[PDB]
């Protein structure tokens, strides 16, 4: 009686994994092909994006199980390796150093150490005595030292480093991802959507929006803002191992600078290869620091305490310092202009909030700015050493950089005496947690355009 | 693209061409750039080959000459084609699906061999 | 190959098929050879997908059931098909062409559902 | 796959779809897999392009409207379709075949232009 029919082009899909590809914003890259993220090679997104809302569509989402974040983590690591591959190596530089104090007095910062060493010229048999300035975190006193001037680099007992090429620009150019044809990207539109759940408002798109590959820890910088409400995302909310992602509704403007006039010198190493170093400091040395508007930060912390105490009732929240550990883990680390910053952040996370709105003084007018000191490393082993270590070349002149804090990485210090006063600390280290805040919305699916239905419709014969 | 995904099958019977309209158009990055095109070509050619085997290729609606089995049948025609949507219907029609393609293939082969046995003398 | 590129549209109706006969025939050099083969496969598949969208695939000459609009119309039938060649005709139909394909598509879709409106009652 | 290769042509006339149903999609290793998938796509697209040229695509058996030349003819119809198998028959029909392809192409083009001349006055 009834007859099967099959239809081509039906609108059904399925969950799948696939290899995405990059797409820039058709920016004028003809001068800037030397970007470290190699974004010039991507296909330019010419037209308007396919902002196609579906309607009557509900689907479950899980951004903690998303494949996309791991793929783009691998892509960032591979980009770093392929950008750092043809640059100059620093194997001959790992020699015995003789070091003294270049800064006159200990002051408030003196960590610019002077050192001298030997190098190989263009000729193999000609050794040349040379000198350079370094930072105290970069250099390590030599083994079995009699409190001497004998010094070495930090990396030399771990792995060799390569310096970054001077043409390389570390500006975070925005990157779009597009699924291949035959696949699709579904994104959420629900305004209060946390990490998991059914999204009532789902729209398809061919390519994602312009997310940015910002290298930072403990503070999300220049991310996409929360649209109307501060979002708290955590995989369990009761396990301390699950890192809380805090998505702020309003940005907090932060300024960071190195004030002193640094100078750059060059040293010939080997046949046709050069090395760049800090030669001298011009003028009076001053402390590298960052500046944050205190009132806005306090009001933001108050609203975060509101959003957390509505998740944790009858418990005061203590904004405390992060747990002790390494320099790269405790300090807020980032880069701006091509140099790397590590900021102290003790006095930044120093406060508390209970159910009472403690601070109506935010309604009063003030110009209080918290200032926190920062230090500078030349040699880094970030992403836990899975890439080759990069020696950042120094940059002449002063450096200034401005940013928006849009998100926080927090952990719950679940102590035994936290029956009423809960402790939340800065956290970080896993760089994909920076990116899960930006890939919370998107999801990849596979189109399956064949359908089966009966209609009692018989083929002619 | 997918402009009527939540609608009924009768409503999607007008917009079934816009899905197939966009199925083929759109050194670290270069590897993925190659891979996406290879995957898209394979994905299109798969079900194009399947429609070619079933013989109803070149048209979006297939008349099959295969009887619908009663074990597959639970709903009425008006219950399906006016009330039901494609995406949730795919969940319940996921059962028994694997033999339908072979049934269509053998019916198409039987039709072709009967047409040959007719037209060899006719 | 391209043996009637300078002739009229009437003459090319004898040659055109052998043009299609050359549409698929045939470590740095290996990379380039792979790129060439992938490009040829994509280029052959794209317009075949367009022909399948219009529904008149499998044949060289299509009849469309779509009326020619007067805004496109300036020349007569003998003024086109006997006086001049394909190249200048493509040059002058460079305007307005980019919508026409889609019209064919939806027209094709209408035919299918009209066919369904017969074949359910067949 | 190839489940009736030893039989006659009439015996394979109902089993000829099992070949085509598995033709398409049935760092050193990744390079080899990429090469294999590209080769499979090309080899599937080649004869499909040839069938599209001959116009009898979409079906497994083609009636051709081309007369069998006497120079190719040595056996009877019952001598072929009952006594002979495909594999050994390919050895003796290996001659003349490249001419036969072009003859099919030009006859198909003649059929298309005659159908156009009929349907222009339809
Ligand atoms: C950090 O947050 C700031 C707001 O808190 C952002 O500052 C705003 O950026 C907008 C876009 O960059 C500006 O809008 C532009 O304004 C100019 C001048 O009025 C117009 O010509 C442009 O058309 C307009 N563009 C758009 C898309 O609106 C805002 O004027 C600007 N200021 C305010 C007070 O809103 C920062 O951009 C943001 N990021 C950084 C890195 O600081
Ligand atoms: C860091 O330590 C090095 C090592 O001493 C300092 O380099 C020394 O710099 C002084 C002047 O800046 C040099 O003196 C000059 O020597 C030349 C001859 O070489 C002479 O013609 C000049 O009149 C002057 O006397 C000295 O040679 C040089 N030594 C080496 C080994 O390079 C460097 O200045 C120190 N940096 C800071 C910021 O103090
Ligand atoms: C390569 O050389 C460096 C430099 O010595 C080695 O790092 C050193 O590792 C030891 C062992 O963890 C550190 O000692 C620790 O010191 C803290 C106090 O700061 C103390 O609380 C711990 O109990 C422990 O004693 C030492 O500080 C650290 N030095 C530096 C400069 O980081 C490294 O282990 C060597 N790697 C290899 C593979 O040999
Ligand atoms: C997220 O964290 C929660 C904890 O808040 C996990 O849920 C379950 O929590 C209960 C108590 O809240 C745990 O029960 C405990 O069992 C031990 C040993 O039986 C007992 O000594 C304790 O007094 C308490 O009764 C339970 O173990 C825990 N579940 C598991 C599997 O450990 C929850 O599993 C976490 N994960 C998710 C995805 O929710
Ligand atoms: C970030 O900045 C904070 C603020 O200065 C640093 O914490 C401070 O560390 C010093 C150690 O150099 C502490 O001084 C010592 O404290 C002990 C214990 O009370 C005392 O007995 C000693 O005589 C000495 O004063 C200081 O207390 C501590 N806290 C404050 C508020 O200054 C912190 O080390 C910096 N770095 C990181 C990675 O957090
Ligand atoms: C900025 O934020 C901080 C903390 O979020 C606010 O400071 C806090 O103000 C409360 C009272 O308004 C202080 O509570 C008092 O603490 C002492 C400590 O012994 C206790 O004895 C009192 O009974 C009372 O509980 C709290 O300590 C203080 N926290 C800090 C870190 O200073 C501040 O009001 C905010 N300012 C603005 C302008 O928003
Ligand atoms: C090197 O240090 C100097 C001195 O701190 C920096 O100059 C300062 O730059 C900021 C913005 O970059 C200036 O603020 C703005 O100035 C404009 C007028 O120029 C004014 O209309 C704005 O309202 C705002 O105040 C600041 O005035 C300027 N100071 C001086 C003395 O020039 C410079 O940016 C640093 N350069 C680098 C590459 O780090
Ligand atoms: C760099 O090389 C020079 C030699 O080219 C070293 O100077 C020698 O050091 C030893 C050890 O104290 C002395 O016995 C020699 O008299 C020194 N002079 C010469 C000419 O050999 C020097 O120690 C090396 N290192 C640095 C940091 O300068
Ligand atoms: C579902 O999401 C879509 C897109 O996120 C919403 O469409 C936007 O609606 C706002 C006003 O509500 C308009 O200003 C925008 O222009 C719309 N987007 C586009 C691309 O046109 C839609 O409103 C949401 N619906 C619900 C019920 O949440
Ligand atoms: C932030 O956390 C540290 C964690 O060590 C707190 O320091 C402890 O404070 C308790 C208070 O009774 C002492 O008993 C411990 O001995 C302290 N430990 C150390 C290592 O000093 C600190 O008090 C917290 N600060 C705030 C404001 O909550
Ligand atoms: C956290 O903030 C509180 C409040 O400003 C700090 O406590 C003050 O510290 C200064 C520094 O010596 C003292 O002069 C004040 O008397 C302190 N006030 C009170 C009420 O104790 C505290 O030091 C800050 N802690 C950190 C780690 O930054
Ligand atoms: C996220 O929201 C969903 C409903 O929107 C809820 O079921 C789930 O418990 C929430 N999870 C967290 C960690 O807030
Ligand atoms: C918990 O807090 C709410 C409001 O924040 C309050 O109404 C309630 O009384 C508190 N619980 C107890 C046991 O006091
Ligand atoms: C919350 O802390 C403020 C700090 O001044 C205090 O005034 C208020 O009484 C506290 N509220 C509760 C419920 O403890």
PDB file of C-alpha atoms in Angstrom, chain A residues 64-253:
ATOM      1  CA  UNK A  64      33.581  22.158  27.807  1.00  0.00           C
ATOM      2  CA  UNK A  65      33.415  19.201  25.409  1.00  0.00           C
ATOM      3  CA  UNK A  66      34.026  21.263  22.266  1.00  0.00           C
ATOM      4  CA  UNK A  67      36.603  19.950  19.810  1.00  0.00           C
ATOM      5  CA  UNK A  68      37.224  23.423  18.367  1.00  0.00           C
ATOM      6  CA  UNK A  69      39.262  24.760  21.283  1.00  0.00           C
ATOM      7  CA  UNK A  70      41.757  21.886  21.129  1.00  0.00           C
ATOM      8  CA  UNK A  71      42.125  22.258  17.361  1.00  0.00           C
ATOM      9  CA  UNK A  72      42.854  25.948  17.640  1.00  0.00           C
ATOM     10  CA  UNK A  73      45.255  25.311  20.532  1.00  0.00           C
ATOM     11  CA  UNK A  74      47.167  22.934  18.257  1.00  0.00           C
ATOM     12  CA  UNK A  75      47.020  25.501  15.453  1.00  0.00           C
ATOM     13  CA  UNK A  76      48.473  28.226  17.685  1.00  0.00           C
ATOM     14  CA  UNK A  77      51.278  25.899  18.824  1.00  0.00           C
ATOM     15  CA  UNK A  78      52.059  24.877  15.239  1.00  0.00           C
ATOM     16  CA  UNK A  79      52.008  28.521  14.116  1.00  0.00           C
ATOM     17  CA  UNK A  80      54.447  29.407  16.886  1.00  0.00           C
ATOM     18  CA  UNK A  81      56.784  26.596  15.848  1.00  0.00           C
ATOM     19  CA  UNK A  82      56.644  27.408  12.138  1.00  0.00           C
ATOM     20  CA  UNK A  83      57.174  31.111  12.790  1.00  0.00           C
ATOM     21  CA  UNK A  84      60.079  30.521  15.160  1.00  0.00           C
ATOM     22  CA  UNK A  85      61.705  27.858  12.951  1.00  0.00           C
ATOM     23  CA  UNK A  86      63.745  29.941  10.431  1.00  0.00           C
ATOM     24  CA  UNK A  87      65.040  32.459  12.983  1.00  0.00           C
ATOM     25  CA  UNK A  88      68.484  32.645  14.558  1.00  0.00           C
ATOM     26  CA  UNK A  89      69.634  30.167  17.213  1.00  0.00           C
ATOM     27  CA  UNK A  90      71.499  31.009  20.422  1.00  0.00           C
ATOM     28  CA  UNK A  91      73.605  27.881  20.966  1.00  0.00           C
ATOM     29  CA  UNK A  92      77.049  29.637  20.801  1.00  0.00           C
ATOM     30  CA  UNK A  93      75.947  32.244  23.331  1.00  0.00           C
ATOM     31  CA  UNK A  94      75.654  29.729  26.177  1.00  0.00           C
ATOM     32  CA  UNK A  95      79.095  30.386  27.690  1.00  0.00           C
ATOM     33  CA  UNK A  96      80.556  31.418  31.032  1.00  0.00           C
ATOM     34  CA  UNK A  97      79.393  34.877  32.088  1.00  0.00           C
ATOM     35  CA  UNK A  98      81.115  37.373  34.372  1.00  0.00           C
ATOM     36  CA  UNK A  99      78.591  39.775  35.827  1.00  0.00           C
ATOM     37  CA  UNK A 100      78.474  42.940  37.905  1.00  0.00           C
ATOM     38  CA  UNK A 101      75.888  45.520  38.946  1.00  0.00           C
ATOM     39  CA  UNK A 102      74.995  48.047  36.261  1.00  0.00           C
ATOM     40  CA  UNK A 103      72.429  49.856  38.415  1.00  0.00           C
ATOM     41  CA  UNK A 104      74.067  52.323  40.806  1.00  0.00           C
ATOM     42  CA  UNK A 105      72.056  51.525  43.946  1.00  0.00           C
ATOM     43  CA  UNK A 106      69.508  48.837  44.799  1.00  0.00           C
ATOM     44  CA  UNK A 107      66.726  51.477  44.689  1.00  0.00           C
ATOM     45  CA  UNK A 108      63.260  50.215  43.884  1.00  0.00           C
ATOM     46  CA  UNK A 109      64.520  48.287  40.843  1.00  0.00           C
ATOM     47  CA  UNK A 110      68.117  47.302  40.064  1.00  0.00           C
ATOM     48  CA  UNK A 111      67.670  44.015  38.198  1.00  0.00           C
ATOM     49  CA  UNK A 112      69.433  45.216  35.043  1.00  0.00           C
ATOM     50  CA  UNK A 113      72.632  43.200  35.499  1.00  0.00           C
ATOM     51  CA  UNK A 114      75.762  43.867  33.456  1.00  0.00           C
ATOM     52  CA  UNK A 115      77.621  40.837  32.120  1.00  0.00           C
ATOM     53  CA  UNK A 116      80.609  40.059  29.910  1.00  0.00           C
ATOM     54  CA  UNK A 117      81.457  36.942  27.945  1.00  0.00           C
ATOM     55  CA  UNK A 118      83.223  35.563  24.875  1.00  0.00           C
ATOM     56  CA  UNK A 119      81.828  35.126  21.389  1.00  0.00           C
ATOM     57  CA  UNK A 120      82.844  33.648  18.067  1.00  0.00           C
ATOM     58  CA  UNK A 121      83.327  36.071  15.189  1.00  0.00           C
ATOM     59  CA  UNK A 122      82.951  35.281  11.500  1.00  0.00           C
ATOM     60  CA  UNK A 123      86.330  33.556  11.709  1.00  0.00           C
ATOM     61  CA  UNK A 124      86.274  30.393  13.811  1.00  0.00           C
ATOM     62  CA  UNK A 125      89.688  30.950  15.401  1.00  0.00           C
ATOM     63  CA  UNK A 126      89.024  34.564  16.480  1.00  0.00           C
ATOM     64  CA  UNK A 127      87.444  34.814  19.920  1.00  0.00           C
ATOM     65  CA  UNK A 128      86.102  38.224  20.887  1.00  0.00           C
ATOM     66  CA  UNK A 129      85.337  39.618  24.328  1.00  0.00           C
ATOM     67  CA  UNK A 130      81.878  41.166  24.492  1.00  0.00           C
ATOM     68  CA  UNK A 131      79.387  42.565  26.980  1.00  0.00           C
ATOM     69  CA  UNK A 132      75.620  42.751  27.355  1.00  0.00           C
ATOM     70  CA  UNK A 133      72.927  43.704  29.833  1.00  0.00           C
ATOM     71  CA  UNK A 134      70.394  41.198  31.117  1.00  0.00           C
ATOM     72  CA  UNK A 135      67.649  40.833  33.672  1.00  0.00           C
ATOM     73  CA  UNK A 136      68.036  38.955  36.943  1.00  0.00           C
ATOM     74  CA  UNK A 137      65.279  36.371  36.148  1.00  0.00           C
ATOM     75  CA  UNK A 138      67.113  35.554  32.914  1.00  0.00           C
ATOM     76  CA  UNK A 139      70.520  34.810  34.444  1.00  0.00           C
ATOM     77  CA  UNK A 140      71.329  32.130  37.006  1.00  0.00           C
ATOM     78  CA  UNK A 141      74.479  32.010  39.179  1.00  0.00           C
ATOM     79  CA  UNK A 142      76.785  29.236  38.052  1.00  0.00           C
ATOM     80  CA  UNK A 143      77.064  25.884  39.797  1.00  0.00           C
ATOM     81  CA  UNK A 144      79.385  25.492  42.844  1.00  0.00           C
ATOM     82  CA  UNK A 145      79.875  29.260  42.931  1.00  0.00           C
ATOM     83  CA  UNK A 146      81.884  30.856  45.729  1.00  0.00           C
ATOM     84  CA  UNK A 147      79.456  33.812  45.619  1.00  0.00           C
ATOM     85  CA  UNK A 148      81.317  34.761  42.448  1.00  0.00           C
ATOM     86  CA  UNK A 149      80.414  36.593  39.253  1.00  0.00           C
ATOM     87  CA  UNK A 150      80.047  33.323  37.347  1.00  0.00           C
ATOM     88  CA  UNK A 151      76.684  33.142  35.607  1.00  0.00           C
ATOM     89  CA  UNK A 152      74.779  31.323  32.881  1.00  0.00           C
ATOM     90  CA  UNK A 153      71.410  31.382  31.198  1.00  0.00           C
ATOM     91  CA  UNK A 154      68.325  29.689  32.618  1.00  0.00           C
ATOM     92  CA  UNK A 155      67.637  27.552  29.547  1.00  0.00           C
ATOM     93  CA  UNK A 156      71.096  26.020  29.136  1.00  0.00           C
ATOM     94  CA  UNK A 157      70.417  22.977  31.310  1.00  0.00           C
ATOM     95  CA  UNK A 158      66.957  22.488  29.768  1.00  0.00           C
ATOM     96  CA  UNK A 159      66.953  23.219  25.997  1.00  0.00           C
ATOM     97  CA  UNK A 160      68.377  25.652  23.489  1.00  0.00           C
ATOM     98  CA  UNK A 161      66.441  28.784  22.575  1.00  0.00           C
ATOM     99  CA  UNK A 162      66.129  30.758  19.363  1.00  0.00           C
ATOM    100  CA  UNK A 163      65.646  34.512  19.299  1.00  0.00           C
ATOM    101  CA  UNK A 164      62.622  35.994  17.589  1.00  0.00           C
ATOM    102  CA  UNK A 165      63.176  37.572  14.202  1.00  0.00           C
ATOM    103  CA  UNK A 166      63.014  41.389  14.383  1.00  0.00           C
ATOM    104  CA  UNK A 167      60.553  41.638  11.491  1.00  0.00           C
ATOM    105  CA  UNK A 168      58.047  39.522  13.428  1.00  0.00           C
ATOM    106  CA  UNK A 169      55.064  41.493  14.742  1.00  0.00           C
ATOM    107  CA  UNK A 170      53.028  40.050  17.615  1.00  0.00           C
ATOM    108  CA  UNK A 171      49.838  42.041  17.096  1.00  0.00           C
ATOM    109  CA  UNK A 172      46.756  39.867  17.696  1.00  0.00           C
ATOM    110  CA  UNK A 173      45.070  40.109  14.296  1.00  0.00           C
ATOM    111  CA  UNK A 174      41.499  38.739  14.519  1.00  0.00           C
ATOM    112  CA  UNK A 175      40.863  35.309  13.045  1.00  0.00           C
ATOM    113  CA  UNK A 176      37.655  33.783  11.702  1.00  0.00           C
ATOM    114  CA  UNK A 177      37.052  30.052  11.432  1.00  0.00           C
ATOM    115  CA  UNK A 178      34.911  28.606   8.673  1.00  0.00           C
ATOM    116  CA  UNK A 179      33.606  25.077   8.383  1.00  0.00           C
ATOM    117  CA  UNK A 180      34.061  23.262   5.069  1.00  0.00           C
ATOM    118  CA  UNK A 181      31.182  23.125   2.626  1.00  0.00           C
ATOM    119  CA  UNK A 182      28.768  20.407   3.642  1.00  0.00           C
ATOM    120  CA  UNK A 183      29.285  21.224   7.312  1.00  0.00           C
ATOM    121  CA  UNK A 184      27.766  24.010   9.359  1.00  0.00           C
ATOM    122  CA  UNK A 185      28.332  26.133  12.444  1.00  0.00           C
ATOM    123  CA  UNK A 186      25.484  26.559  14.925  1.00  0.00           C
ATOM    124  CA  UNK A 187      25.795  29.265  17.567  1.00  0.00           C
ATOM    125  CA  UNK A 188      23.708  30.206  20.575  1.00  0.00           C
ATOM    126  CA  UNK A 189      21.838  33.472  20.931  1.00  0.00           C
ATOM    127  CA  UNK A 190      20.415  33.120  24.441  1.00  0.00           C
ATOM    128  CA  UNK A 191      21.620  36.109  26.399  1.00  0.00           C
ATOM    129  CA  UNK A 192      22.130  34.363  29.753  1.00  0.00           C
ATOM    130  CA  UNK A 193      23.514  31.128  28.346  1.00  0.00           C
ATOM    131  CA  UNK A 194      26.100  29.553  30.634  1.00  0.00           C
ATOM    132  CA  UNK A 195      28.474  26.801  29.512  1.00  0.00           C
ATOM    133  CA  UNK A 196      25.982  23.952  29.091  1.00  0.00           C
ATOM    134  CA  UNK A 197      22.283  23.592  28.427  1.00  0.00           C
ATOM    135  CA  UNK A 198      19.652  23.812  25.697  1.00  0.00           C
ATOM    136  CA  UNK A 199      19.857  27.011  23.678  1.00  0.00           C
ATOM    137  CA  UNK A 200      16.370  28.210  22.784  1.00  0.00           C
ATOM    138  CA  UNK A 201      17.675  30.669  20.182  1.00  0.00           C
ATOM    139  CA  UNK A 202      20.117  29.081  17.732  1.00  0.00           C
ATOM    140  CA  UNK A 203      21.459  30.640  14.536  1.00  0.00           C
ATOM    141  CA  UNK A 204      23.636  29.120  11.843  1.00  0.00           C
ATOM    142  CA  UNK A 205      26.620  30.897  10.339  1.00  0.00           C
ATOM    143  CA  UNK A 206      29.233  30.081   7.721  1.00  0.00           C
ATOM    144  CA  UNK A 207      32.130  31.723   9.569  1.00  0.00           C
ATOM    145  CA  UNK A 208      32.732  32.671  13.184  1.00  0.00           C
ATOM    146  CA  UNK A 209      33.277  36.228  14.342  1.00  0.00           C
ATOM    147  CA  UNK A 210      36.646  37.877  14.776  1.00  0.00           C
ATOM    148  CA  UNK A 211      38.058  36.209  17.864  1.00  0.00           C
ATOM    149  CA  UNK A 212      41.527  37.240  18.908  1.00  0.00           C
ATOM    150  CA  UNK A 213      44.503  35.046  19.857  1.00  0.00           C
ATOM    151  CA  UNK A 214      45.433  37.076  22.921  1.00  0.00           C
ATOM    152  CA  UNK A 215      48.331  35.598  24.888  1.00  0.00           C
ATOM    153  CA  UNK A 216      47.544  36.270  28.549  1.00  0.00           C
ATOM    154  CA  UNK A 217      46.988  34.582  31.887  1.00  0.00           C
ATOM    155  CA  UNK A 218      44.754  35.416  34.905  1.00  0.00           C
ATOM    156  CA  UNK A 219      43.109  38.311  33.014  1.00  0.00           C
ATOM    157  CA  UNK A 220      41.288  38.010  29.701  1.00  0.00           C
ATOM    158  CA  UNK A 221      42.196  40.968  27.494  1.00  0.00           C
ATOM    159  CA  UNK A 222      40.171  42.492  24.629  1.00  0.00           C
ATOM    160  CA  UNK A 223      37.701  39.618  24.584  1.00  0.00           C
ATOM    161  CA  UNK A 224      34.114  39.761  23.436  1.00  0.00           C
ATOM    162  CA  UNK A 225      32.062  41.486  26.110  1.00  0.00           C
ATOM    163  CA  UNK A 226      29.125  39.920  27.864  1.00  0.00           C
ATOM    164  CA  UNK A 227      26.061  41.457  26.274  1.00  0.00           C
ATOM    165  CA  UNK A 228      23.979  42.335  29.339  1.00  0.00           C
ATOM    166  CA  UNK A 229      24.897  40.175  32.350  1.00  0.00           C
ATOM    167  CA  UNK A 230      28.076  38.946  34.026  1.00  0.00           C
ATOM    168  CA  UNK A 231      28.362  35.236  33.255  1.00  0.00           C
ATOM    169  CA  UNK A 232      29.915  32.634  35.548  1.00  0.00           C
ATOM    170  CA  UNK A 233      30.967  29.418  33.818  1.00  0.00           C
ATOM    171  CA  UNK A 234      32.306  26.398  35.687  1.00  0.00           C
ATOM    172  CA  UNK A 235      32.244  22.720  34.791  1.00  0.00           C
ATOM    173  CA  UNK A 236      31.042  21.553  38.207  1.00  0.00           C
ATOM    174  CA  UNK A 237      30.926  24.712  40.428  1.00  0.00           C
ATOM    175  CA  UNK A 238      31.645  22.491  43.454  1.00  0.00           C
ATOM    176  CA  UNK A 239      35.015  21.036  42.437  1.00  0.00           C
ATOM    177  CA  UNK A 240      37.992  23.327  42.947  1.00  0.00           C
ATOM    178  CA  UNK A 241      39.735  21.850  39.899  1.00  0.00           C
ATOM    179  CA  UNK A 242      37.123  23.385  37.574  1.00  0.00           C
ATOM    180  CA  UNK A 243      38.344  26.850  36.633  1.00  0.00           C
ATOM    181  CA  UNK A 244      35.679  29.520  36.920  1.00  0.00           C
ATOM    182  CA  UNK A 245      35.463  31.754  33.858  1.00  0.00           C
ATOM    183  CA  UNK A 246      34.053  35.172  34.720  1.00  0.00           C
ATOM    184  CA  UNK A 247      32.670  37.095  31.745  1.00  0.00           C
ATOM    185  CA  UNK A 248      32.259  40.770  32.574  1.00  0.00           C
ATOM    186  CA  UNK A 249      29.443  42.890  31.207  1.00  0.00           C
ATOM    187  CA  UNK A 250      31.528  46.076  31.089  1.00  0.00           C
ATOM    188  CA  UNK A 251      35.237  46.428  30.293  1.00  0.00           C
ATOM    189  CA  UNK A 252      37.831  47.795  32.697  1.00  0.00           C
ATOM    190  CA  UNK A 253      40.504  49.903  31.032  1.00  0.00           C
TER     191      UNK A 253
END
